[PDB]
């Protein structure tokens, strides 16, 4: 409706008997392949991304936002737990870091 791509903003310009809209949009570019999984199995529990997606570069698993590649460590802060690992089809095994663990470890 407001240009090709994900719409960011628009600017109006007057024209003889008309209007010209300059649509400023965000277009994704330079995409890269990654191996993906619906959920991460850790401690017999299924972890799902709170806002992002699980990606793998070949050896390690990360969670990133869907529209830009920004890999982050899979923690309890950006994932949520619902059920065990026996129901979700295609769940893979990976560790889930806990931020609270070094606090009581020290």
């Amino acid at each position: 409706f407001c240009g090709k791509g994900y719409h960011l903003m628009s600017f109006p310009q007057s024209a003889p008997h008309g209007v010209v809209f300059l649509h400023v949009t965000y277009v994704p570019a330079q995409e890269k392949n990654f191996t993906t999984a619906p959920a991460i199995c850790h401690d017999g529990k299924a972890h799902f991304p709170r806002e992002g997606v699980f990606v793998s570069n070949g050896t390690h698993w990360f969670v990133t936002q869907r529209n830009f590649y920004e890999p982050q460590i899979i923690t309890t802060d950006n994932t949520f737990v619902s059920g065990n690992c026996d129901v979700v089809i295609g769940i893979v095994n990976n560790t889930v870091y806990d931020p609270l663990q070094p606090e009581l470890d020290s």
């Binding site: 791509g5 277009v27 994704p28 995409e31 619906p38 959920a39 979700v88």
Partner: protein
């Protein structure tokens, strides 16, 4: 008596090809192809994204994936039967 019918610029096979391209883009890439380059995504993950769009968590889609697929297939068959059976 001077009446002529001009053929359409797009023939039926080309329009079908356009619909096929749109179907392939929306199945294999979701909504990414409409906003830029087509980015591949698995279809259950795409359905989970759509579920998140309407305010339902991903777990609900993943746990009940077989039921959702069965319901979708049944609905598509009912659509074909309804179109074939209604004048």
């Amino acid at each position: 008596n001077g009446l002529t019918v001009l053929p359409p610029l797009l023939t039926d096979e080309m329009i079908a090809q356009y619909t096929s391209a749109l179907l392939a883009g929306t199945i294999t890439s979701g909504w990414t192809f409409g906003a830029g380059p087509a980015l591949q995504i698995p279809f259950p993950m795409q359905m989970a994204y759509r579920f998140n769009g309407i305010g339902v968590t991903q777990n609900v889609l993943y746990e009940n994936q077989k039921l959702i697929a069965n319901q979708f297939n049944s609905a598509i068959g009912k659509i074909q039967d309804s179109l074939s059976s209604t004048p």
